[model samples]
Target chain A: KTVVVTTILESPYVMMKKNHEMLEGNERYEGYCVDLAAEIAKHCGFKYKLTIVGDGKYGARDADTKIWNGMVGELVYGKADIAIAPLTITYVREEVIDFSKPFMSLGISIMIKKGTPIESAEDLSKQTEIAYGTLDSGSTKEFFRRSKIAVFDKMWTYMRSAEPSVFVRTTAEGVARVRKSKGKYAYLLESTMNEYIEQRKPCDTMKVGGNLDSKGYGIATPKGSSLGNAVNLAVLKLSEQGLLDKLKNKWWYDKGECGS
Target chain B: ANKTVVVTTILESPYVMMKKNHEMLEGNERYEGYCVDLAAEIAKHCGFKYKLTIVGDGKYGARDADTKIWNGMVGELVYGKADIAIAPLTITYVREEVIDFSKPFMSLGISIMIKKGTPIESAEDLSKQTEIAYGTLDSGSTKEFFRRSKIAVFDKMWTYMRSAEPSVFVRTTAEGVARVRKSKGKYAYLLESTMNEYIEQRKPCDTMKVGGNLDSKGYGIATPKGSSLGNAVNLAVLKLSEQGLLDKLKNKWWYDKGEC
Candidate 1:
């Protein structure tokens, strides 16, 4: 059986090509994660179909129901055989899905409009003048919610209860918020995405300070799936052979539009 | 004329260690480690002379609950007893409240250290199933992390560890190492990633670091809040890192050796 990979249509990970009309099947998309999946499938001798996750959410557990949603739910419900996007390897997700060793490293980082006064999480959490938040559906949001670290907990409490609740429904909306807020707002997102956006057009956004937490994105398979071992090995072999590095360079730099 | 800055440090191996013939040496010659070389490079770049003095209590500087006074290099900074601290001092919230830190000179995280054959693969694994008990260095940043953690997994872990019978803690890294070796994989030690990695490459090589680091943080050259020297020290460190001096020094202390 062919593998069905569930991923989000996030930029710099999965995107449409200018000439996608001429492309067939998976050829319609091009980006870092797209390249990575081709590498994994080549190493594992598997044919796969790349499908965008239905709900467009990055996956989060509903606090009241304890049920997963988004791409995570797709994998949990057997709708997708694997998830190969910027899915984070969080403790919450690891309980239900097995992640290969990280194919890419990232962490929760702050994104601000140029000239914003914030320098660190400490700076943003302690002040009331500048509002900040994360995409409502992603790991960054869950990180703040589930974090026990003092500063992170403090930031969560603020964002959770702030008069104008800071969480956004999508990364694009969050970036747009930062762009339009006139230095009054900052967005928290994966460092990889933040770096990519910083190099795109309009260039008014910048990543400030170091990450609040460190984690990575892993290729995920349903728990106990036999493909787990083969996929993990393929990732490890690619990493050791320096192909992961080469792929990152090819996608993040060689394709950089803003002097990356 | 520039005043000779009094630098406070700790005698932590590979970061700061006593020379083989420390008794015969004077001034800075009395100490060595990654931090020693770093301190020298920092001071020289900032155009200042300095005296290296170990912290009086030989602690890594944590706040005392009983008296609310800080101890270790941080205490030296808080009370103005020392002008600066050049140790492998982790940057944490409590300490940040009373002192100013330069840009991080070394990045590290809380990590899991276990003897070979330990079934545990990460802090998450140990937290979920407790067949094997774990503890952190007593009264330092690592322990403080668990003590302050609010995340469910870490909170449960801290709950177990905080009131653990027979005390699952140690006074120093050496004691922790010895305990891990003797416990035969029954105990895991939580400590800074830097020390854990250094020890992993040491004699016996029986101890191994597992999984990804739990969180992201770093060590900074700290100064009393609002100290004039803060700006210069921060710039000096950035320059050292940029010049490749920091990597060279890390090799000199952690990797380019053979005792273990």
Candidate 2:
């Protein structure tokens, strides 16, 4: 039986081929997360098909309509056997589904338009002249919302009261806002994603701050799925054997197309 | 004057103890062991002076229970009685909340110890008879393991012990070991594999047999939560462990039963 693995079309993780008609199962379009999922599937002795989510969101229940999107929706509604994108593991997501041990560790970071005066997440929290936003309903957004720490609490206060027009709908939107607004707007995102993006062409963005908080991306599956154990063990095995690092370097650093 | 860091310790033989000449000896001479050696190395690396002080209670973790005071070496750090803790404290969830841990200096596991003539060979054998009762060290990693396990085999074993007709829990590994030694094959003690191995080579070696390991993990130096010394101390531990310095110290203080 073939398991349907769900992922997203994010740069350095997954992207459309430059030549539209030239993609195959193991070639043409591949990235760090894709290669990791393929290797993990082989180790767990399972056959799989990679399917992209229809929407470019990290999955959340729409506050206004209560509808779910992204990989979270796919897993909640049983449309996929596993999700191996850089989908973060959070308490909210964990309530509805099971996640394997972390496959890639990361933390929330701020992306600034190059030469911005803000040098850290701490700087962003202490100032009001500049506005910052994270992808709506994502882990970074939720982190600030649920935090009890002083800086995070302050950031949350600002975000909760900020005009809806200033909040972003997606990471791409947040990045665009940062780029277009010059030094006045900042984007909050995962350190790994920020670093990955910084190395891409037209690299006009830079990541600042020691990570705001620590977390990891994990493999997600429906709760009580039989494949959970095998997949978890496979990810751990890859971690122990240094295969995860090898794959990260291969796809994110070596095969990257950045001019620099 | 050099900065003095307070270190919490326990009375585990060959690991930490009040020296015979401690009352007359100065500074470093008051405490000596494999752990003491490790503490010295870490202090040197981090450029700090340290004083070893024993924890009032013997529990291996800090708990929020009746004893608001921290337990074992970690407790001392948590309660502000110490700045660094160099003891055989295992890294676990509850302890991670109140303290930071250095990289592991030694690997160990929970093991089962049966009286000389007992029929138990593995954890698998423990479930067959209700007559043979078992208990684990209280407030230590072994007890925590039973309390948190979700696996079927472990859950069944923990459920049987916790709800036993007479309650099979013991207050300490030493007490459990004593009960097994005197109960004529009716009681077994669950403790760390390293401690069991050390005891098995002593005078009463023929009276106890260390059996199958329950789970494996490591022991680390602990610091108070948010302490600046964490990274420096962790690096020191990794260096010692890598250079076989840690193993040498273990042999000198623990395994070398010279002429006695």
Candidate 3:
């Protein structure tokens, strides 16, 4: 049986090829995760179909309804057999699904206009002149929501209650705000994407400060799914073979539009 | 009724180490450090009793090429000698294939440890020179990282390391660090940043962690593949990490009594 893989559309992980309409099936998409999914399936010896998550959110639980949404919901509800994307491995999410060892390590970080004065999370938390926020319903937002660290807690307090709403609906939106705000807005996002952006053309944004915390992006499957073991093993094999690093370069740097 | 879990560990300072008065104590009482403290918390959260035993081989873990047998803490789990492993043992791709690891309790990366005034500032520099010999702890993830890497600089470094005239690998981290100290700028040690940073703060403080880490990963509690305890242990790690216990424990072992 073909495994049904759910994923998200995000730069350097999953993205539309230049002429997507001319292609079909897996050939329709390209990026790091697309390449990774191929390696995983080949190793696990499974044919798979990739479908974008319907809701367009990474994954989050509703506070009022207690319902899971995004790619996580797809797996939990059995709409897809697994998720091969830039999904983060977090504690709350771990309780509901199984995650392979991280395929990529990352941490929450601050993204700012190149000329911005902010250099660290503490710098952002101590001032009111610049506005900062996270992509709604993702681990970075959840990180601030759950953080007990003094600076992060303070920043979360401001983000959750700030007037006019500081959170953005997508990473692109967050990046757009940073570029257009003229240094008035800084976005908190994962370092992987932040670094990817720094290497793109018109690269006016830069990741500032050390990552706020350390974690990884994992391939996820529904808890108790039969495919879990094989997929997990496959991730390890690819990692040791250095295929993971090769895939990363293929998507993030090889195709990089900006110069080093 | 729940049986006592046997945990396999190692005697890496600040992670798991014999107490100053070890002869006066017995069982778990003779040990104290970050992993020792972490093991206690994991047992408490998962509601199980555990006995801590150091690995007989004194290795983190590795596979024997000829016999195809695993050794060290990993072998303990693979061969059913222990119910778990808790130490500074890294979460690596090869190890993940035979055993399961909980989410990381701490994050680290491969780093360069150089004696003060060594003039080496990066891995690139180490690769480009020969006067200052460098090596890694034998049978560890750091060594594996170099062995498996395809990146231009790292690949070159690995080639040099594997063929060095004097066998540029140490039997233990202590041995590697000693070489750095005794060589007086003629040797450098490649090890995880966590241990590097901890050693940097210890007595004499002659060794410093230089260069951005070569790669990012973490240390996790490990169990036999498919062990029922894997699920709960993984969740407990996440709980401790989220509750800030991991960060607190880090400060306790790494910085609270810093000599420098």
Candidate 4:
């Protein structure tokens, strides 16, 4: 049976090619993760299909119904055989799924329109004029909700209660909000995405200050799945051979829209 | 019947160390530090009794180039001398191939430790000059990073270090720090930021951490490949990280007794 891999559509990780209707099957999509999946499958000697995650979310567990959603949910519910996305490796999510060693290292960071006054998370926490928020149903939101650190907790309090609802359903929505707010809004997201967006056309957004926290993105599978061990070894192999770094530079910098 | 799990670790300050009254204590109670506290919590959650045993060779772990044999805590796990390794063992591609690591419970990166008024502000500064001698701890990930790096600056630094007069590498992190302290700004130490930051706050704290980190990675709890205890210990690390226990333990050991 062909392995069904579930992933999310985010810039630099997964994206649609131009004139998409003319392509079929795996040929329809291309990005960093698409290349990585090919490497993993080649090393593991497996055939697979890449499917975009429904609901366009990384993943999170609902507090009320105790249900998981997004790419994480698909793996847990057997709707997808494996998940290859920019899905973060977090504590709560690890309880329901098994993740390979991280293919990339990243952290929560701030994204602001160019020339914004903000310089650090502490700056955002102590001010009122500028508004900030994270993508809903993702690790960024969960980090703020669970943190006991003073500055992060304070910022979370403001975001949770802000009028007009500070949270966005997707990263694109958050970036759009920042671009249109005229220095009145900031987006909290993983540094990987922040850096990628900073190099894209328009170049109106920049990642400011140091990352707020550090973690990584891992390929995930259902707990106790037979493919878990094989995929885990494949990631390590690719990493040592420098293929992972080559892919990162190819996707994030070599194809960058902005000048170095 | 349940056997007491043997945990192999090293005596690295702040991560693991002997208490002043160690001669009067028994078993795991003889040691105290970040990893000591972590090991206890891990055992409590996973419902196992474990004995903390210092590694015989006193190395972090590296495979001998010719023999294809590993040494240090990693060797202990590979040869079945310990059921798990609970210390500041870094999660790296080489180590992960022969053992299984949980998601990192603590994140860190390679950083520079310079005596105050050393005039070096960045790695680029170090790479460009010969006045200041620099080296990394032998058999650790910091050295491995330089040896394998393809980036221009790091590759140049590595070439100079590998054949420098007096042999730039040190056998232990403590030796590296001592060299920095005694060389009167002529020698700089490359080490993990966590240790560098801890030493910065200790008595006679004349050295300071300079520059942003050169790389990002983490320390993970590791077990032998295919071991049954691997899954449970891995899950426990994630649970403790999410509950804020790991952060609390870090503060308790690293900054609570600040001298600077």
* Highest DockQ model number: 3
Q: Local distance difference test, per candidate? A: 0.84, 0.75, 0.90, 0.90
Candidate 3, overall lDDT? 0.90
lDDT computed for candidate 2? 0.75
Q: Write the per-residue lDDT of candidate 3 for residues A51-71, one digit (tens) a residue.
A: 999989999999999889999
Q: What is the TM-score of chain B alone in each candidate?
A: 0.96, 0.88, 0.98, 0.98
Query: For residues A110-133, could you state the per-residue lDDT of candidate 4 as single tens digits?
Result: 999999999999999999999999
Query: For model 2, which pairs clash?
Result: B70-B75
Which lDDT value does model 4 have at A165? Answer: 92
Interface CA RMSD of each prediction in angstroms: 19.5, 15.5, 2.5, 3.3
**Candidate 1 colliding pairs:** A148-B150, A148-B151, B203-B260
Q: Any residue pairs clashing in model 3, and if so which?
A: none
TM-score of chain A of each: 0.95, 0.90, 0.97, 0.98
Better of 2 and 3 by lDDT: 3
DockQ of prediction 4: 0.35
lDDT of 1 at A251: 66
Expressed as tens digits, the lDDT of each residue in A135-214 for candidate 1 is 97788887778666678889999999977878888888999999999999999999998988898878899999997665
Which candidate gets the maximum TM-score versus the true structure? 3
Residue pairs clashing in model 4 are none
Error of 4 at B30 (Å): 3.3
Tell me how far the alpha carbon of residue B195 in candidate 1 is from the true structure, in angstroms, after superposition: 0.6
